[PDB]
């Protein structure tokens, strides 16, 4: 089963990483949309 | 040339698929007479509904049948099975001992007449199909009506 892991460790890694990154960013924007500034 | 094989083979060319042909020689047989049995036992004295929905029986028609028809392959694929009283020492094509009581009896061939009873019951039961389908009436209505007005 070593094989599947490696398979998931090529440029696909990039897609999974960018999909995870996109999901994070979009969800952040859902909770805090129309953000023109950091006010805290 | 439909007949000649020469395959590895993904099974269109080699020996089986005529193997199956041998064994549907038997349930097109049990299927036929077993289907006329309710038809003419009532001769003396379309959704249609029985018990629950018969899809439920199915799950138990493809259940046991599963637990059954499964193993049968096992023998084929490889002689033994071994799980239960179960013996299946007979050859893969046929395993008469143990599930045929007392007899043991195959060579005349009968097998050539059992495959002869086979594919005539195929076309007999293939009768039943296109028969009651494109017409709209059962196999025994038009048949009786066919010796009635031949021309």
């Amino acid at each position: 089963r070593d094989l599947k892991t490696y398979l998931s460790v090529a440029p696909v890694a990039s897609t999974l990483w960018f999909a995870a990154l996109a999901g994070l960013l979009i969800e952040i924007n859902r909770l805090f949309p129309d953000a023109l500034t950091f006010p805290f | 040339g439909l007949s000649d094989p020469e395959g590895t083979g993904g099974f269109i060319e080699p020996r089986w698929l005529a193997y199956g042909e041998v064994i549907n020689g038997r349930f097109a047989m049990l299927g036929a007479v077993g289907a006329i049995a309710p038809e003419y036992l009532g001769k003396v004295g379309g959704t249609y509904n029985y018990w629950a929905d018969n899809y439920t029986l199915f799950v138990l028609e493809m259940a046991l049948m599963g637990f059954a028809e499964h193993r049968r392959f096992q023998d084929w694929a490889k002689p033994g099975s071994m799980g239960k009283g179960n013996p299946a020492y007979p050859g893969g094509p046929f395993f008469n001992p143990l599930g045929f009581g007392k007899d043991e009896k195959s060579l005349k061939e009968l097998k050539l007449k059992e495959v002869k009873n086979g594919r005539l019951a195929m076309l007999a039961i293939l009768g039943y199909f296109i028969q009651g389908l494109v017409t709209g009436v059962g196999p025994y209505q038009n048949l009786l009506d066919h010796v009635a007005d031949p021309v």
């Binding site: 979009i26 924007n29 | 395959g7 590895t8 083979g9 993904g10």
Partner: protein
């Protein structure tokens, strides 16, 4: 390189990564074993079919759950066909616009809505099933490829039996395929649509299967179906003529071809492909040896001819691929010019947005495939041409007088170019100087296309005379005095041909001839040339052979496809432009109560398309206003993609106007900055190869260019139509 071991080996430069994808499908470079290749591509076709099958499943699925097809069905005239919905994120929801039927979605132009009405589809239930059936097929196709490469791969002998394959494909697929569809029409499409045209409403239509079972429902209309025995076995066939006719023309209520005709069409096509299927020799005697027949043709001019062809087209894929690509592309083009002139779908012609995008889509697909024929034809010359083993003789001579063919074709393009573009530069100059009498115009010195005008004239007077069975014309562009108007929109109308139409056709003659020149020159001179006597040893895809001989850049057959690729863009790009303006100016419009027809641009094509300034102003500048004013509306995306395409386009010029020598030297300075901070990759960064930079360049050029009109057109017709 996964495909090859040495190729896989190890990566030392980034060039390895680019090569890996570039030769991924180059199956004949991974092995010299023909059987291995053939086995590879055969499975690859399965994998393809799976993807398009999945593609179809999503189109039916989206039509079911994410579309207002039902809503469009009751009111097709002013409901906008819309599939797919956009989630309300980072301001996206504005792309969901008023399309009618109390629904928010993006207006579509694929034309599935018109297809589905023709098929007699009435409910999302029906679309839902077809989507699943497609997915089930997609699962099969994908599985089938795995089974025929790892379990049971066919012999080379299997693929070589071309006769048997021919017989089936133009009979088993074409014939029965046409026949099978012919049955669905008269049993489902024709009955249900007949109801739909009577304003019965979809839910008030009986289910399709009720039409098939009992003849009663199907027989009250089309009473030929009444006889159970049917007049078919009587072989009179005259009785059947109610459900199928040779009426032609166009239904004045639905604006599409009579399904009453298409059923008869397929009925003929089917058996016509069933008979023609019984031609080639197989096993049971009757048939043809294509090898034999091919040999028979010979000539005082050709000497031996076609002899040896059968050997070539049975051992070389690139040879077969070129032929197929050349005509499949050519077929896509004639499809574009047959669906616009003879609208085959209900409420298709009325939907201007769909028609523009359909014609334009088929023109590009057809255009690209033809260019691909040039590539593989050239690949065949470099990789598979061997006179020692497979001489043809036809191929010879061609190679023998190749300097002749190109030189003549070179001249024709110059003659055409002058006698096309020059006329416009004439008109542009005479109008600027204030002398329109001088120009090539209908009002001044006119150059009437009397030949095309004469062919149209005979098509008008065809029904009754040279076509008794035909009640009406083939297409209403050949009608004469007829006019179909579905809704308040004009479905079709006789299209006039003037001096403005004489010029533009001669531009298409030109652009096609030059495109042919570039591509054909690359195929013939793919192996040898006076400049490079051994080009074939350099391969099909090589950048050059040095600055020697004054400079030998882009001498490869690959680069001839590269140069001809821009020209195929230049070509179509002006065909679709001809289509857009002519249809808007002299065909599409609104018809009133009195019968007065007002076109979208108001017949300005005839006197303003004869000038270059006229296309730049009355066409581009004018009809752009939609795309450049689409911000804050539902067509917001088109405005962005219009700007987005203009960028990927100008982005291509960066790759096309420069060379890799500059870039590699620039990287050197950048690698230094990395080595200073321990951030130098072990995989050394290299610039793109000389050839890749051209490949990268043309792709972005075509993308930015094509994409840019896409947004042009789709913003225009939607806001106006």
């Amino acid at each position: 390189g996964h495909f090859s071991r040495t190729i896989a080996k190890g990566p030392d430069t980034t060039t390895w990564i680019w090569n890996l994808h570039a030769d991924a499908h180059d199956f004949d470079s991974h092995t010299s074993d023909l059987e291995e290749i053939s086995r590879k591509v055969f499975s690859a076709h399965f994998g393809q079919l799976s993807i398009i099958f999945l593609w179809l499943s999503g189109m039916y699925f989206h039509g079911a759950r994410f579309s207002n097809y039902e809503a469009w069905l009751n009111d097709p005239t002013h409901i906008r066909p819309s599939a797919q919905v956009v989630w309300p994120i980072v301001g996206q929801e504005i792309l969901n616009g008023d399309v009618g039927g109390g629904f928010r979605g993006i207006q579509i132009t694929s034309g599935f809505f018109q297809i589905w009405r023709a098929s007699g589809i009435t409910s999302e239930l029906q679309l839902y099933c077809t989507a699943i059936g497609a997915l089930v097929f997609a699962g099969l196709m994908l599985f089938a490829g795995w089974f025929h490469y790892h379990k049971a791969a066919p012999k080379l002998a299997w693929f070589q039996d071309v006769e048997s394959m021919l017989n089936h494909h133009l009979a088993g697929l074409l014939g029965l395929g046409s026949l099978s569809w012919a049955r669905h029409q008269v049993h489902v499409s024709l009955p249900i649509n007949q109801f739909l045209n009577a304003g019965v409403d979809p839910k008030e239509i009986p289910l399709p299967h009720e039409f098939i079972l009992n003849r009663d429902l199907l027989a009250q209309l089309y009473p030929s179906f009444a006889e159970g025995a049917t007049p078919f076995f009587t072989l009179n066939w005259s009785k059947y003529a109610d459900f199928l006719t040779f009426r032609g023309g166009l239904d004045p209520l639905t604006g599409g071809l009579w399904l009453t005709d298409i059923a008869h069409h397929h009925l003929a096509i089917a058996i016509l492909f069933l008979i023609a299927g019984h031609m080639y020799r197989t096993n049971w005697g009757i048939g043809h040896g294509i090898k034999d027949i091919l040999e028979a043709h010979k000539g005082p001019f050709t000497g031996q001819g076609h002899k040896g062809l059968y050997e070539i087209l049975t051992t070389s894929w690139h040879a077969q691929l070129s032929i197929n690509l050349a005509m499949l592309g050519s077929l896509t083009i004639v499809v574009a010019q047959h669906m616009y002139s003879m609208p085959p779908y209900p409420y298709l012609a009325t939907d201007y947005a769909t028609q523009l995008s359909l014609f334009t889509h088929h023109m590009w697909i057809g255009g690209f495939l033809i260019v691909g024929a040039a590539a593989h034809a050239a690949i065949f010359m470099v990789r598979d041409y061997d006179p020692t083993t497979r001489y043809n003789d036809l191929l010879d001579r061609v190679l023998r007088h190749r300097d002749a063919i190109i030189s003549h074709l070179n001249w024709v393009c110059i003659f055409l170019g002058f006698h096309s573009f020059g006329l416009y530069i004439h008109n542009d100059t005479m109008s600027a100087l204030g002398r329109p009498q001088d120009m090539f115009s209908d009002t001044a010195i006119q150059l009437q296309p009397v030949f095309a005008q004469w062919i149209q004239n005979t098509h008008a007077l065809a029904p009754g005379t040279t076509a008794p069975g035909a009640t009406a014309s083939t297409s209403l562009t050949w009608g004469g005095g007829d006019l179909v108007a579905v809704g308040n929109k004009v479905a079709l109308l006789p299209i006039p041909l003037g001096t403005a139409d004489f010029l533009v056709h001669h531009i298409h003659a030109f652009t096609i001839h030059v495109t042919v020149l570039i591509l054909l020159k690359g195929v013939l001179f793919a192996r040898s040339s006076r400049l490079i006597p051994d080009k074939a040893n350099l391969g099909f895809r090589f950048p050059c052979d040095g600055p020697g001989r004054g400079g030998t850049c882009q001498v490869s057959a690959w680069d001839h496809v590269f140069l001809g690729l821009f020209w195929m863009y230049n070509s179509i790009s002006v065909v679709i432009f001809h289509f857009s303006w002519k249809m808007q100016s002299d065909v599409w419009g609104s018809i009133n109560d009195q019968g007065v027809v007002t076109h979208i641009t108001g017949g300005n094509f005839a006197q303003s398309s004869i000038t270059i300034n006229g296309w730049l102003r009355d066409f581009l500048w004018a009809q752009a206003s939609q795309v450049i004013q689409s911000y804050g509306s539902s067509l917001s995306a088109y405005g962005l993609f219009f700007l987005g395409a203009h960028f990927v386009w100008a982005f291509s010029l960066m790759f096309l106007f420069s060379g890799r020598g500059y870039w590699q030297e620039l990287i050197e300075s950048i690698v230094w900055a990395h080595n200073k901070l321990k951030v130098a990759p072990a995989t050394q960064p290299r610039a793109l190869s000389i050839v890749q930079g051209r490949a990268v360049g043309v792709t972005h050029y075509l993308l930015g260019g094509i994409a840019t009109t896409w947004a042009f057109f789709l913003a225009r017709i939607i806001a106006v139509g």
